[PDB]
Design a protein around this ligand. Structure first.
Ligand SMILES: O=C1O[C@H]([C@@H](O)CO)C(O)=C1O
Ligand SMILES: [Ga+3]
Length: 427
């Protein structure tokens, strides 16, 4: 293998003929005003300690990101990566002081970056001689920080000899299709002291990868299918680095509006005159019961457990999600009641056996899934790393109720219940 930088003579030709979908802008193309405004936003966020490293699950394993990070952007939005749903600390489209001003700042930056992106995608679709407008509609930014020479060893980038790296080779998952990504970098063989972003064609380690030096304020853009045709990575220097990576996320199953409406659909099968521990289900068509138990699972695990695993990231940063998340927890325990209601009806004296088997076969996949996933989550909350962390770094394991708590109709452990119903059906 090998790699190239603006030193090498064939760099510019390799870029033109094998990486053309990538664009650079030196800090020189950006306002003075904007430059120091964003840097001051960045810094006041570091002093207040909002940048958290997240505790992730990847291929069965519980790991700790060396970069610290935070997710800002559209209110009600979420962005899922490495099995972690980051929730928006919001910026002001139509909470705590001194932080509002940085979110405002990064939104101004988002508008600027939008502008430049659309110009570039114009020129590109011009070389080709609502996709454009929406592939620039950045809805969130993932900010991230790393102080090198605090890591105890950094992985040597292994296919091209690019030296130590702070982010392995990857694509930016879960973005809308052919959407660009706009980065703002902030620094302080190839040169090891200076920060670089490195690039390579996927599956490929013959074609020499590029490694672009990024000085303070340098910006770049991954356009069209670039983010899919190539993977990238971030090579470290010696000074701490910031970067703000602005993206258009697939938030079609990941907004507070969406999960709420899902809840209303589940609850439509429920007699809603009053609200008490007294759930009487409106229908028993198997399909409806199944859709209910699925929405049960979706709000429990994609929304509750996720929110509370990033234990106190949130009520430290903003309060925005509090009333929302409280509301989601309420709807979830009413769904617990719905489930207990079905569990009652299925064993009732004088229910025809064929209906019993139909209703079982409708719900059992969702019950089994709820069981397996509560197992994973209590495991992850009592992880190697988790159960021995800073006392605030610990994730919370919510919802979790004990046996004696009668406020909850059904147990937290359902293995015997799934065993029971499966032992009915296979007879
Ligand atoms: O520099 C980067 O920061 C983000 C981070 O989220 C890594 O997972 C990303 O995707 C990069 O390439
Ligand atoms: Ga990336």
């Amino acid at each position: 293998g090998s790699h190239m930088t603006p030193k090498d003579d064939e760099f510019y030709q390799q870029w033109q003929l094998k990486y053309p979908k990538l664009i650079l802008r030196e800090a020189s193309s950006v306002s003075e005003e904007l430059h120091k405004e964003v840097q001051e936003a960045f810094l006041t966020l570091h002093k207040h300690g909002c940048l958290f490293r997240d505790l992730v699950r990847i291929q069965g394993k519980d790991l700790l990101t060396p970069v610290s990070r935070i997710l800002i952007g559209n209110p009600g939005c979420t962005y899922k990566y490495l099995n972690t749903r980051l929730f928006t600390v919001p910026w002001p489209v139509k909470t705590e002081a001194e932080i509002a001003a940085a979110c405002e700042t990064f939104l101004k930056l988002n508008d600027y970056l939008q502008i430049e992106t659309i110009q570039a995608l114009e020129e590109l679709a011009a070389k080709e001689k609502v996709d454009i407008k929406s592939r620039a509609a950045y809805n969130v930014t993932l900010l991230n920080f790393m102080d090198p020479q605090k890591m105890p060893y950094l992985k040597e980038e292994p296919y091209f000899g690019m030296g130590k790296m702070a982010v392995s080779w990857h694509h930016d998952e879960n973005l809308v299709d052919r959407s660009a990504v706009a980065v703002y970098s902030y620094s302080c063989g190839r040169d090891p002291d200076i920060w670089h972003v490195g690039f390579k064609i996927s599956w490929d380690i013959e074609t020499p990868g590029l490694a672009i030096p990024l000085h303070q304020g340098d910006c770049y853009f991954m356009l069209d299918d670039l983010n899919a045709t190539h993977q990238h990575c971030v090579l470290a220097g010696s000074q701490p680095r910031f970067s703000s990576t602005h993206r258009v996320a697939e938030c079609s199953t990941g907004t507070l509006d969406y999960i709420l409406q899902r809840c209303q659909l589940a609850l439509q099968n429920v007699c809603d005159d009053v609200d008490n521990d007294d759930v009487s289900l409106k229908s028993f068509e198997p399909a409806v019961l199944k859709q209910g138990e699925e929405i049960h699972n979706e709000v429990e695990f994609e929304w509750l457990r996720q929110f509370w695993f990033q234990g106190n990231r949130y009520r430290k940063c903003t309060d925005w999600w509090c009333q929302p998340m409280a509301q989601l927890e309420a709807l979830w325990k009413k769904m617990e009641g719905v489930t207990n209601a079905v569990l009652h009806e299925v064993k009732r004296e004088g229910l025809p056996v064929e209906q019993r088997n139909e209703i079982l076969t409708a719900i059992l996949a969702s019950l089994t899934a709820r069981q397996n996933l509560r197992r994973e989550w209590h495991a992850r909350c009592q992880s190697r790393i988790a159960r021995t962390l800073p006392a605030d770094q610990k994730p919370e394991c919510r919802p979790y109720w004990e046996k004696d708590d009668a406020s909850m109709p059904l147990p937290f452990d359902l293995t015997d219940i799934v065993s029971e119903l499966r032992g009915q059906l296979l007879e």
